[PDB]
Amino acid sequence: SFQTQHDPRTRLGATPLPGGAGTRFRLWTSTARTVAVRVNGTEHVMTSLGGGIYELELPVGPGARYLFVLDGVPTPDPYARFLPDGVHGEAEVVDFGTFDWTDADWHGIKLADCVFYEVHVGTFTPEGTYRAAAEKLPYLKELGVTAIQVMPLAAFDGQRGWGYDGAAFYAPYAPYGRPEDLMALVDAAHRLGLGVFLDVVYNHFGPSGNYLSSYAPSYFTDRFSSAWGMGLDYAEPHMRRYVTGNARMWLRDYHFDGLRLDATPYMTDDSETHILTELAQEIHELGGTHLLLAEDHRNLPDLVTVNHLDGIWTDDFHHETRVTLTGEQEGYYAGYRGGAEALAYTIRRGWRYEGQFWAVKGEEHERGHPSDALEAPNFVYCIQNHDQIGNRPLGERLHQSDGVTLHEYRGAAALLLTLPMTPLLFQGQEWAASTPFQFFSDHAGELGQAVSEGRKKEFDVPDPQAEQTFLNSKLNWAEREGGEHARTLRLYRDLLRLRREDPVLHNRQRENLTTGHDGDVLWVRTVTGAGERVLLWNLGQDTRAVAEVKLPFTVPRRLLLHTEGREDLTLGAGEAVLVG
Ligand SMILES: OC[C@H]1O[C@H](O[C@H]2O[C@H](CO)[C@@H](O)[C@H](O)[C@H]2O)[C@H](O)[C@@H](O)[C@@H]1O
Ligand SMILES: OC[C@H]1O[C@H](O[C@H]2O[C@H](CO)[C@@H](O)[C@H](O)[C@H]2O)[C@H](O)[C@@H](O)[C@@H]1O
Ligand SMILES: OC[C@H]1O[C@H](O[C@H]2O[C@H](CO)[C@@H](O)[C@H](O)[C@H]2O)[C@H](O)[C@@H](O)[C@@H]1O
Ligand SMILES: OC[C@H]1O[C@H](O[C@H]2O[C@H](CO)[C@@H](O)[C@H](O)[C@H]2O)[C@H](O)[C@@H](O)[C@@H]1O
Ligand SMILES: OC[C@H]1O[C@H](O[C@H]2O[C@H](CO)[C@@H](O)[C@H](O)[C@H]2O)[C@H](O)[C@@H](O)[C@@H]1O
Ligand SMILES: OC[C@H]1O[C@H](O[C@H]2O[C@H](CO)[C@@H](O)[C@H](O)[C@H]2O)[C@H](O)[C@@H](O)[C@@H]1O
Ligand SMILES: OC[C@H]1O[C@H](O[C@H]2O[C@H](CO)[C@@H](O)[C@H](O)[C@H]2O)[C@H](O)[C@@H](O)[C@@H]1O
Ligand SMILES: OC[C@H]1O[C@H](O)[C@H](O)[C@@H](O)[C@@H]1O
Ligand SMILES: OC[C@H]1O[C@H](O)[C@H](O)[C@@H](O)[C@@H]1O
Ligand SMILES: [Mg+2]
Numbered sequence: 001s002f003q004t005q006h007d008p009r010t011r012l013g014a015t016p017l018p019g020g021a022g023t024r025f026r027l028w029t030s031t032a033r034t035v036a037v038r039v040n041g042t043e044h045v046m047t048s049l050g051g052g053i054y055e056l057e058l059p060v061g062p063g064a065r066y067l068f069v070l071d072g073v074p075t076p077d078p079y080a081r082f083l084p085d086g087v088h089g090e091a092e093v094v095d096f097g098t099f100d101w102t103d104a105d106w107h108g109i110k111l112a113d114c115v116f117y118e119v120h121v122g123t124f125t126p127e128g129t130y131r132a133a134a135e136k137l138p139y140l141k142e143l144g145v146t147a148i149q150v151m152p153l154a155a156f157d158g159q160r161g162w163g164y165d166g167a168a169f170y171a172p173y174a175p176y177g178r179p180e181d182l183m184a185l186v187d188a189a190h191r192l193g194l195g196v197f198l199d200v201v202y203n204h205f206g207p208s209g210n211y212l213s214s215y216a217p218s219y220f221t222d223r224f225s226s227a228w229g230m231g232l233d234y235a236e237p238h239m240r241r242y243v244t245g246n247a248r249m250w251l252r253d254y255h256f257d258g259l260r261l262d263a264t265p266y267m268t269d270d271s272e273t274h275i276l277t278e279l280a281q282e283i284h285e286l287g288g289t290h291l292l293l294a295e296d297h298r299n300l301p302d303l304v305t306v307n308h309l310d311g312i313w314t315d316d317f318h319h320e321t322r323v324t325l326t327g328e329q330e331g332y333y334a335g336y337r338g339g340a341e342a343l344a345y346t347i348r349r350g351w352r353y354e355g356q357f358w359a360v361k362g363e364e365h366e367r368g369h370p371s372d373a374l375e376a377p378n379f380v381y382c383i384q385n386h387d388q389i390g391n392r393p394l395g396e397r398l399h400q401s402d403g404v405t406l407h408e409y410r411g412a413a414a415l416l417l418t419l420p421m422t423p424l425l426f427q428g429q430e431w432a433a434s435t436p437f438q439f440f441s442d443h444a445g446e447l448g449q450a451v452s453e454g455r456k457k458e459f460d461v462p463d464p465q466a467e468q469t470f471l472n473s474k475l476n477w478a479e480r481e482g483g484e485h486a487r488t489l490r491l492y493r494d495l496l497r498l499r500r501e502d503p504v505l506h507n508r509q510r511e512n513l514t515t516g517h518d519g520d521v522l523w524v525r526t527v528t529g530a531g532e533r534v535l536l537w538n539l540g541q542d543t544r545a546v547a548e549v550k551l552p553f554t555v556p557r558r559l560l561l562h563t564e565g566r567e568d569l570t571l572g573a574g575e576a577v578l579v580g
Helices: 129-132 135-144 181-189 239-253 276-282 316-326 329-337 340-349 386-390 406-418 445-458 465-472 477-481 483-501
Strands: 013-016 023-028 033-041 040-044 048-052 053-058 066-070 071-074 114-119 147-150 170-171 197-202 222-225 228-233 259-261 290-297 312-314 355-359 364-370 379-382 422-426 515-518 522-528 531-538 559-562 576-579
Touching: 023 033, 023 066, 033 053, 040 053, 053 276, 129 181, 135 483, 147 329, 170 239, 181 197, 181 239, 197 239, 239 259, 239 276, 259 276, 276 290, 316 329, 316 340, 316 406, 340 515, 340 522, 406 483, 406 522, 406 531, 406 576, 483 559
Parallel strands: 114 147, 114 422, 147 197, 197 259, 259 290, 290 312, 312 379, 379 422
Antiparallel strands: 013 023, 023 053, 033 040, 033 066, 048 053, 066 071, 222 228, 355 364, 515 522, 522 531, 531 576, 559 576
């Protein structure tokens, strides 16, 4: 008995009409006195319906170019489905019904079956497009990942960017390709049995290209702020529907399997039904098997158990692992000791902070909640992602940080990919890629200069606005063929195959997972009806024989995988083994 608030008949923007009758244009404005649509250069006055709603039907079809004219001012459509000339230009009318999908036998993917692979379309290939990315899908399938996690695609200003400056949420960023190129990428992924997930940003709009306030200032509020402007007012139903209609488009019209919601703590809403709950209702109304994940630092199980999201990106594991390997203590890393004992605890508890004091200077509070309600798949774990690489001054990867060996890097992979939690890898991680992932942008004018200055002051640091910073972040695919890159890749393939094939690692219950330590050796034990596995990781500087590790059970005898391919049950510094 939840009923969607959305009806194609009243859809804001430009929507093709049935029977080849053309396009219906609709907008909401609280302040304009005159309202017109300019289509292929010709202006037509729109009909006032009440409630600030304006409408017009014209015989123009998909491909027509338009914007709205508010009190004589040409203004881009916030509901644009494509912006071929960028965020300050005319929109194109898009018809989602003409693409020939071939994925009728694809029925989504469960979270417990996801191994995420985070892609940035612009850097993932030389071309930096969907079409070039699609040619890497067979590689990803063979690698053994099961779900692609795409960084944000909403149109933003400039010729490159991470995606978090998105401003026109319904319009896929034109430099990556046209709408049908994105559909082709999803269709190709589904053919190979891969899920595709999209990063969406419903806590803020980027600084350039967001014209919502030109239509109605009340989309936003001064009660609080975003990084770029006034806060998104979820007490305003039109604002709620902007984001729920967007989520529905990505899932229904582009066939995405799920969404990753950026910075959910900053989707502020005091409404009786929280916007996160309504998002879940609205996407579930579509009647598929779509997933919703939250990027949330609050260690708050209610996101799953009350808002009915599927899982949470939970960084305590990542942070505990990084501190273990580097000793670093700047910023939020000061929240963690690291080490075998510490890692055993964080895994045991899912996340570390369950209400205890977070003593990080500038952020002091009682952080988190008991994790008991959450099951292993509800936690998304990683040792690398876009933020944990790119928010570093030089954008260096884990194996490129001072004091980290390739042996330690490979051990960390074994830990991540044998846990029952839902893992995520960042593009190129699997071959210990040589290239950084730096923060880059391409804003115009004074805003561009402010970005460059802001980055300098925050922390030489690579200028985010420089072309070189973007190019230096491009993946080098050929390097995976050789040397330590190939060795690391061989290990990732072996780990992913085992995750897939090993009947005990199929465990997805925290009841069946225990952890502990002996000195600097971490152990992780899984026991099910199918048998027993133990992962031992030597986080020390010395060599440790598995037979001398003190354990509260008898260690299994069979060596299933050693991260350095050794024959004997001995762990050099940083090395790991899986036994059964
Ligand atoms: O929903 C798609 C399929 O998901 C599962 O299979 C995928 O995920 C597994 C666990 O990560 C992988 O081992 C496997 O290679 C993938 O195909 C599920 O087992 C299938 O029944 C689903 O059809
Ligand atoms: O039409 C004026 C400008 O409106 C938008 O910019 C406002 O909203 C941004 C947040 O999305 C703020 O960062 C900015 O300071 C505001 O002016 C739009 O993004 C701009 O392109 C317009 O010029
Ligand atoms: O304030 C947020 C919520 O806090 C509690 O829920 C969390 O902590 C509980 C135990 O203290 C757990 O049982 C629960 O799974 C956590 O989400 C409180 O019980 C909730 O009502 C609050 O919404
Ligand atoms: O060497 C001085 C530091 O010793 C500890 O930190 C080391 O040991 C931790 C495990 O207990 C590792 O996670 C960490 O990477 C090491 O640097 C101590 O915690 C630090 O406060 C000391 O400065
Ligand atoms: O994880 C605790 C911190 O979470 C948020 O910080 C960021 O999340 C990533 C690091 O965990 C960052 O790289 C990203 O830029 C933020 O979303 C929170 O903002 C911090 O205050 C916490 O210390
Ligand atoms: O496929 C989801 C479950 O897979 C495993 O459990 C299955 O196989 C077990 C053999 O050890 C049986 O005990 C169990 O009845 C089967 O569901 C995995 O161990 C579970 O955690 C998953 O939920
Ligand atoms: O309360 C002190 C510690 O108790 C646990 O650790 C002990 O028991 C584990 C399981 O037998 C062993 O792995 C470990 O070596 C013992 O010290 C708990 O796991 C730790 O977090 C506590 O610090
Ligand atoms: O901090 C936790 C709380 O944050 C927000 O106020 C949410 O609306 C509420 O559901 C949640 O309990
Ligand atoms: O200092 C105020 C702190 O309180 C909070 O609830 C947030 O978790 C933290 O990010 C913030 O900095
Ligand atoms: Mg000992």
